[PDB]
Design a binder for this molecule. Structure first.
Ligand code: HEM
Ligand code: HEM
Ligand SMILES: C[C@H](CCC(=O)O)[C@H]1CC[C@H]2[C@@H]3[C@H](O)C[C@@H]4C[C@H](O)CC[C@]4(C)[C@H]3C[C@H](O)[C@]12C
Ligand SMILES: C[C@H](CCC(=O)O)[C@H]1CC[C@H]2[C@@H]3[C@H](O)C[C@@H]4C[C@H](O)CC[C@]4(C)[C@H]3C[C@H](O)[C@]12C
Ligand SMILES: C[C@H](CCC(=O)O)[C@H]1CC[C@H]2[C@@H]3[C@H](O)C[C@@H]4C[C@H](O)CC[C@]4(C)[C@H]3C[C@H](O)[C@]12C
Ligand SMILES: C[C@H](CCC(=O)O)[C@H]1CC[C@H]2[C@@H]3[C@H](O)C[C@@H]4C[C@H](O)CC[C@]4(C)[C@H]3C[C@H](O)[C@]12C
Ligand code: FES
Ligand code: FES
Lengths: 359, 359
């Protein structure tokens, strides 16, 4: 049967191999929905070229690239299989990968969706917590596409723009934390510090009203409640990319601080990005790890596994889409409110794009 | 029967009359658990005198003082009433008010509790969300009391150091939001923006690892889930003081920004302080209110009522103490972990004070 319902899985994407780093960075620094730079069209290319060496080295340290495409595809296949059983009235379902900075690009995915003659299209962000820099940019890309081709969608659109506390997502995090805790000595498991680490945001973005910090905090609370507060925790942020102020505490400085204060066992939890990504200083630098181990005597620093191919995660995705369909919603109530200090004219347009959709 | 269980209700307190402002500020600027200043013993007095006029004016604008003592007492009476029936085995129960900067002072309350020959003493913070600047300072004051007097406690201590998501607290917030929404025109109720407004924190405190922002965010999520996301919202921060960087967005700037962007109906919610306190610029300054109304055409800016004397809140307090007693816990698991970058040697001492208590 011809595909009836399409699920566009949105994420930033990642360079599959080290050779894909340059174009990844080029598209990233050109994104006006992510950052604003003077003469951006000319400055971005320069920054991308100049920064490619450093980033290639970082990806080499984690295997030689990002596994986001393979993991997203696997999750997409699992999701669709469950959906065909859960929602027979909207079946068959088909998933499409829409990466912001690498192929398949958001634009390429929309193009294919239209060609498949879908009846329903769902913009399903793969970031559980909403940030104008992530989901916002991906959604704006959908609006920009149609406003670029000067044509109106031939499909009925809607969006699942956030899901910071979905029960199955929370169950997955809890399961991975418990599984990792089992790797620490039994006599020390109770002393392990759970350090939830989410990518930071520049303070200029936090102060304009970005929804992300509050939503990430909500995910953390739900996970700790599920874990019955078995261990102490702190939500910290990984930044270390520029000179200006970013939301802290910084993950690196926090690990050092905790160890200097007697906490020798730490469990890092990737609470806001479900795929493997670049790790922190104390996980990749031998010199630093040794300096820390000798000065504070750190004993164990581990990182919980990314949600990757957890079947319960595919179940979470299918559940989200199913509920979305049953609710007949076009977007979350939250998407109808722009940041109090939003200065990006496209945000309002994207909002209207979804709230005004047929049906 | 003579009092058996004492519940020390901890809060910062507030000047009952404009004549109490000076002493209130003096003690506040002298609090090393709140802030550290050069030659603090000398600067504190200077700063207090200099700000007394401004602060007296602020309290005059809201009635001529802080009603925290009256509300805390009413809540304490209601709490005790319920506890005597809920937990006969620990009755009679008696509440004590322990304000950090005004009478009855924390130290004065502990002294009375010991004289009453209590068997059990519970340090019950009245701040639902934990900050080392609020609950932390109040708890440290308890440790400091016994350390300065040079004697060990004659009562068995324990503490309810946080309760950001207690179900009845959440129900109270939801109830007050709904009743205030009813005050908006029927045709606009769906357009109202819920602006949760918590007191801000200096970024130096946020970046050292203070637990507050994440816990406040959790309260917000729980309230919105209870309200079934009926309206859009944002968590903003109010009343920052000084020229240094504080966590934003600022409540004032956010109200102006929202109005400039078309949001003419706003509902402010006191999500992190349970009693009436100093309001924001657009609620008190007629000049700014006018400019805003003429510049963007504000329609309605209302504030949800403080928990004050809501009976459901008294039930919340009793439920918290009851569960605490039944659990036999000495403190939350979170209290056993200091900020990753804590530089106050007393914090660790206070922690051990509670975790090591008899029983
Ligand atoms: C406006 C705020 C943000 C800015 C300006 C920003 C900027 C950047 C930049 C410039 C890079 C390229 C790498 C480099 O040159 O070092 C990058 C990579 C990345 N960012 Fe962000 N970012 C922001 C928010 C976020 C958020 C909220 C998330 C998470 C959900 C995130 C996740 C990532 C990931 C996963 C990478 C790929 C490399 C890695 O694994 O760290 N970013 N970001
Ligand atoms: C380390 C961070 C904090 C600092 C430095 C701080 C500082 C101050 C200062 C200096 C004042 C006295 C008035 C003035 O001079 O303007 C004040 C008042 C006050 N603070 Fe804080 N504060 C902090 C955190 C908090 C937090 C987390 C809460 C809330 C739970 C809070 C609630 C209040 C209240 C209720 C008042 C009385 C005025 C009002 O009603 O708004 N403060 N604070
Ligand atoms: C001036 C501009 C910020 C403008 C603004 O905030 O309104 C900032 C943001 C990006 C900065 C540039 C980027 O950081 C890339 C380069 C970094 C080098 O250390 C200085 C030159 C360099 C080319 C920077 C020049 C300048 O400080 C820039 C261009
Ligand atoms: C770190 C990077 C330069 C890397 C390099 O030159 O190798 C620079 C260039 C573009 C800059 C960003 C852009 O200037 C847009 C934002 C400007 C704000 O004032 C700070 C955050 C903000 C998001 C900047 C963060 C950081 O300074 C960036 C990302
Ligand atoms: C230097 C110190 C901050 C030290 C630090 O952050 O490590 C700051 C914080 C409090 C400030 C003081 C307070 O603001 C009170 C006074 C304000 C006057 O405008 C200057 C003198 C004045 C006495 C300030 C001197 C100096 O700027 C102080 C003492
Ligand atoms: C606003 C007040 C000065 C009021 C006045 O001079 O009239 C000043 C004096 C003491 C200052 C505080 C102290 O310097 C201690 C902290 C220093 C950090 O750099 C900012 C937060 C920090 C908590 C400061 C906040 C604010 O700047 C304060 C509270
Ligand atoms: S930047 Fe957040 S809505 Fe535009
Ligand atoms: S300042 Fe937070 S534990 Fe000391």
């Amino acid at each position: 049967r011809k595909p009836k319902t399409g699920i566009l899985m949105l994420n930033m994407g990642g360079p599959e191999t080290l050779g894909d780093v340059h174009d990844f960075l080029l598209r990233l620094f050109l994104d006006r929905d992510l950052m604003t730079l003077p003469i951006q069209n000319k400055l971005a290319p320069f920054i991308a070229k100049r920064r490619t060496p450093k980033i290639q080295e970082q990806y080499r340290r984690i295997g030689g690239g990002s596994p986001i495409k393979i993991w997203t595809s696997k999750q997409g296949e699992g999701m669709v299989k469950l959906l065909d059983e859960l929602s027979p009235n909207t079946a068959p379902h088909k998933y499409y990968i829409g990466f912001r900075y690498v192929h398949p690009l958001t634009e390429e995915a929309i193009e294919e969706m239209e060609r498949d003659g879908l009846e329903r299209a769902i913009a399903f962000t793969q970031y559980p917590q909403y940030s104008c820099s992530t989901t916002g940019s991906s959604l704006n890309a959908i609006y920009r596409y149609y406003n670029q081709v000067g044509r109106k969608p031939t499909m009925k659109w809607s969006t699942i723009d956030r899901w910071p506390t979905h029960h199955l997502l929370i169950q997955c995090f809890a399961d991975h934390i418990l599984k990792e805790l089992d790797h620490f000595p039994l006599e020390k498991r109770s002393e392990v510090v759970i350090l939830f680490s989410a990518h930071s945001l520049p303070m200029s973005v936090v102060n304009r009203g970005d929804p992300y910090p509050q939503e990430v905090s909500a995910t953390v609370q739900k996970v700790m409640e599920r874990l019955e507060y078995c261990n102490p925790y702190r939500l910290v942020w990984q930044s270390k990319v520029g000179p200006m102020p970013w939301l802290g505490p910084q993950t690196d400085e926090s690990i050092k601080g905790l160890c200097e204060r007697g906490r020798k066992n730490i469990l890092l939890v990737p609470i806001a990005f479900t795929s493997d990504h670049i790790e922190t200083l104390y996980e990749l630098d031998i010199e630093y790890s040794q300096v820390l181990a000798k000065e504070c005597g750190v004993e164990n620093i581990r990182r919980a596994e990314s949600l990757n191919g957890n079947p319960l995660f595919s179940k979470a995705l299918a559940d989200l889409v199913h509920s979305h369909i049953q609710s007949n919603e076009l977007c979350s109530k939250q998407l109808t409110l722009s940041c109090p200090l939003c200065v990006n004219p496209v945000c309002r347009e994207t909002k209207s794009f979804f709230t005004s959709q047929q049906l």
